[PDB]
Amino acid sequence: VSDFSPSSWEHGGYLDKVEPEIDENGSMIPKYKIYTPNNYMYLICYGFVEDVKKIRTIAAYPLGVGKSASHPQDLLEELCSLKVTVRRTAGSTEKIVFGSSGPLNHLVPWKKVLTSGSIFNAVKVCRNVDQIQLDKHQALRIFFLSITKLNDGIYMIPRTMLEFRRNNAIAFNLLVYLKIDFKVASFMLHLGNFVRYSVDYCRRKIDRMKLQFSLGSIGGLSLHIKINGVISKRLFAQMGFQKNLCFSLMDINPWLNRLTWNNSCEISRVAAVLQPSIPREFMIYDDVFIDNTGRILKG
Amino acid sequence: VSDFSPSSWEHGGYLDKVEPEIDENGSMIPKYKIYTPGANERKYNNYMYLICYGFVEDVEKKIRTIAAYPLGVGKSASHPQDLLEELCSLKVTVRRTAGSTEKIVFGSSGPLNHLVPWKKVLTSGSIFNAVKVCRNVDQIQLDKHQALRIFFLSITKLNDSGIYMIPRTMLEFRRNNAIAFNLLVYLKIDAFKVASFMLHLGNFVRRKIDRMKLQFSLGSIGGLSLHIKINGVISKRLFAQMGFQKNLCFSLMDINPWLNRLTWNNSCEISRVAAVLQPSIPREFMIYDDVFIDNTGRILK
Numbered sequence: 001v002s003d004f005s006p007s008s009w010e011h012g013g014y015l016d017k018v019e020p021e022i023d024e025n026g027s028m029i030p031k032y033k034i035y036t037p038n039n040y041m042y043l044i045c046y047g048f049v050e051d052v053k054k055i056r057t058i059a060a061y062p063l064g065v066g067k068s069a070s071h072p073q074d075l076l077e078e079l080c081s082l083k084v085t086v087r088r089t090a091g092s093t094e095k096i097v098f099g100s101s102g103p104l105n106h107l108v109p110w111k112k113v114l115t116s117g118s119i120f121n122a123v124k125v126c127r128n129v130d131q132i133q134l135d136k137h138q139a140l141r142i143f144f145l146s147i148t149k150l151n152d153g154i155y156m157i158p159r160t161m162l163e164f165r166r167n168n169a170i171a172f173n174l175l176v177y178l179k180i181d182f183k184v185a186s187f188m189l190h191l192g193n194f195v196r197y198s199v200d201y202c203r204r205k206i207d208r209m210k211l212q213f214s215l216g217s218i219g220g221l222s223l224h225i226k227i228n229g230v231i232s233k234r235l236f237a238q239m240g241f242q243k244n245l246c247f248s249l250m251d252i253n254p255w256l257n258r259l260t261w262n263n264s265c266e267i268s269r270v271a272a273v274l275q276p277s278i279p280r281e282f283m284i285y286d287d288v289f290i291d292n293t294g295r296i297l298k299g
Numbered sequence: 300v301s302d303f304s305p306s307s308w309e310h311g312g313y314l315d316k317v318e319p320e321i322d323e324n325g326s327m328i329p330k331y332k333i334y335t336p337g338a339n340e341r342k343y344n345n346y347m348y349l350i351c352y353g354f355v356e357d358v359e360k361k362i363r364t365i366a367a368y369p370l371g372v373g374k375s376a377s378h379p380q381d382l383l384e385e386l387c388s389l390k391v392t393v394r395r396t397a398g399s400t401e402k403i404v405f406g407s408s409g410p411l412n413h414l415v416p417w418k419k420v421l422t423s424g425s426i427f428n429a430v431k432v433c434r435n436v437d438q439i440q441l442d443k444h445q446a447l448r449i450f451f452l453s454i455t456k457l458n459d460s461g462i463y464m465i466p467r468t469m470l471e472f473r474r475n476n477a478i479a480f481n482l483l484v485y486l487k488i489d490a491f492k493v494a495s496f497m498l499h500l501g502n503f504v505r506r507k508i509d510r511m512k513l514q515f516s517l518g519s520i521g522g523l524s525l526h527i528k529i530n531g532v533i534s535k536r537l538f539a540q541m542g543f544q545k546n547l548c549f550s551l552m553d554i555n556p557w558l559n560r561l562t563w564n565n566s567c568e569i570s571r572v573a574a575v576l577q578p579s580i581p582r583e584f585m586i587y588d589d590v591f592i593d594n595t596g597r598i599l600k
């Protein structure tokens with residue numbers, strides 16, 4: 001467990017609070033913000049969920065990655081002219097369903113999401129889903145469009161994560177602390193394994209990497225790592241031109257949304273946690289409801 | 300949106316607080332508790348779900364936190380006091396590490412006898428999502444060896460004819476031109492703090508739901524489970540589908556892991572249950588379990 005220097009997160013370690021703005025005459029004026037931690041763009045908008053004037057709550061509507069040359073003000077204005085419905089319902093978990101909208105022009109790169117209904121896990125796109133009505137029609141009045149520019153870099157979600165188990169190796173784990181306007185949350189993630197080399201030797205290799213950490217708004221909150229120094233011949237062959245790693249933090253740690261919602265978020269500490277790797281023989285139990293017989297749960 | 304009567308959850312709608320007990324001289328005495336919703340019939344070989352709770356403490360000495368160690372379903376005829384005593388004689392190590400998410404890794408040692416039906420979990424290392432088995436994983440040390448000192452064994456009996464659900468076994472909820480039967484459940488937590496969640500039961504092609512005479516109770520599968528029993532009547536097609544039986548169970552910490560942060564170290568109780576009848580979500584709607592969507596297919600495979 002060795003701490004990185006604060007300079008490694010100073011430049012981009014801050015994510016601004018999502019907030020509506022007013023014009024000179026007090027009317028809400030939609031806005032956008034671009035994070036670049038420029039044609040591939042991730043879009044996520046925020047709006048008021050209202051009756052069809054009464055404001056029930058705020059909700060996020062992720063649109064995903066699209067390739068576009070349109071100016072962000074044209075993406076924003078077209079988005080605010082759409083009629084987006086909001087429903088609170090359930091599948092396995094409680095859901096927020098956004099209705100279909102159209103026609104599109106500047107937003108055609110995000111048509112897969114916008115032109116048909118979209119079902120989201122309510123916990124990832126809203127803190128207080130219980131405020132959305134079940135007996136009244138609801139609609140989204142968008143006030144902010146968050147944009148994060150991507151480089152077609154390594155972008156991770158739980159299903160694309162690689163195997164972390166290894167038998168004779170040192171795991172390079174990363175412990176990150178977030179200060180929320182103060183409340184402090186922390187999480188750990190596995191970066192890789194240094195296959196067998198002492199823990200101190202591994203630390204010197206990590207110092208030479210000159211890692212930089214920053215935050216983005218992919219999924220509402222993402223962690224971006226950039227290698228500004230040097231890496232091994234084996235890791236260099238695996239990665240090639242890739243120097244950037246990005247993690248969708250609301251998909252890995254959905255519990256973060258309840259904490260960062262409607263608040264500013266910033267990296268306050270980052271530490272390398274070098275531990276023996278978890279052996280391949282150990283069993284992964286993602287679900288606590290385990291069935292050792294064959295009779296209660298299939299495969 | 301119609302509320303069920305409180306009588307529908309009175310009998311089994313309560314889950315006791317997990318807490319250690321002391322003897323007449325102040326020393327901790329491990330205990331067990333059996334929950335039998337949806338499995339009240341007595342049989343020699345019982346299907347039993349086991350989850351224990353212990354103090355995570357230093358080895359070479361402070362109590363750092365409490366953690367749950369799920370053992371899963373095993374078929375056994377042993378008395379619960381023999382399962383408990385053998386479990387407390389094992390030397391279980393605890394490690395805080397990471398995969399995709401932060402993990403708590405257990406390691407058991409000591410041969411098994413009454414615990415042989417749970418050997419798959421106990422005889423090799425077990426990697427759990429820290430959020431589902433511990434509220435404050437950041438209290439577990441990274442620079443010291445840690446051990447589990449078990450104080451409670453929670454047991455929930457199962458009936459192999461019943462339906463037991465986890466996210467990967469739950470069925471398709473989308474349908475065109477149907478009415479969804481959704482269920483809104485409220486839990487009162489002593490903390491009182493009230494949490495609520497909704498789940499999809501099925502789709503119809505209120506009076507039919509009243510005739511079902513549903514009963515709701517809580518169990519300790521995964522630390523907290525919801526059990527529904529049909530005491531009235533249903534259609535011939537729905538009885539054939541449910542496997543010719545009237546029990547349905549949901550592992551609530553696997554569906555709604557956020558509940559653990561709220562119910563941890565507290566008693567939990569059903570305070571309200573309502574049917575929420577809505578138009579079904581059409582099949583044309585897209586499911587986005589991950590908020591990081593890639594419409595280009597060039598960023599994510």
Ligand SMILES: CCCCCCCC(=O)OC[C@H](COP(=O)(O)O[C@@H]1[C@H](O)[C@H](O)[C@@H](OP(=O)(O)O)[C@H](OP(=O)(O)O)[C@H]1O)OC(=O)CCCCCCC
Pocket residue numbers: 154162163164166169172191192193194195209225227235238239245
């Ligand atoms: C796109 C996927 C991610 C790309 C790499 C993103 C970075 C990353 O994950 O590094 C892993 C690497 C090796 O560790 P590790 O034991 O995890 O080795 C890899 C791992 O086993 C994968 O699961 C394998 O893929 P697959 O499932 O069998 O296919 C992969 O092989 P292949 O696939 O080649 O056959 C293995 O190489 O870690 C270091 O060198 C430690 C320093 C890390 C410093 C990082 C600082 C930022």
Ligand SMILES: CCCCCCCC(=O)OC[C@H](COP(=O)(O)O[C@@H]1[C@H](O)[C@H](O)[C@@H](OP(=O)(O)O)[C@H](OP(=O)(O)O)[C@H]1O)OC(=O)CCCCCCC
Pocket residue numbers: 462470471472473474480500501502503504527529537540541542547
């Ligand atoms: C292991 C068993 C698990 C399932 C049983 C556990 C309970 C459960 O899941 O019920 C679902 C049932 C109907 O569900 P729903 O109509 O959405 O689902 C369809 C139904 O299952 C048909 O039988 C399937 O085949 P088919 O059309 O014949 O070909 C059809 O498949 P396919 O057309 O897509 O291929 C399914 O889409 O719900 C009610 O009746 C509402 C009252 C619920 C009352 C409360 C119950 C406690």
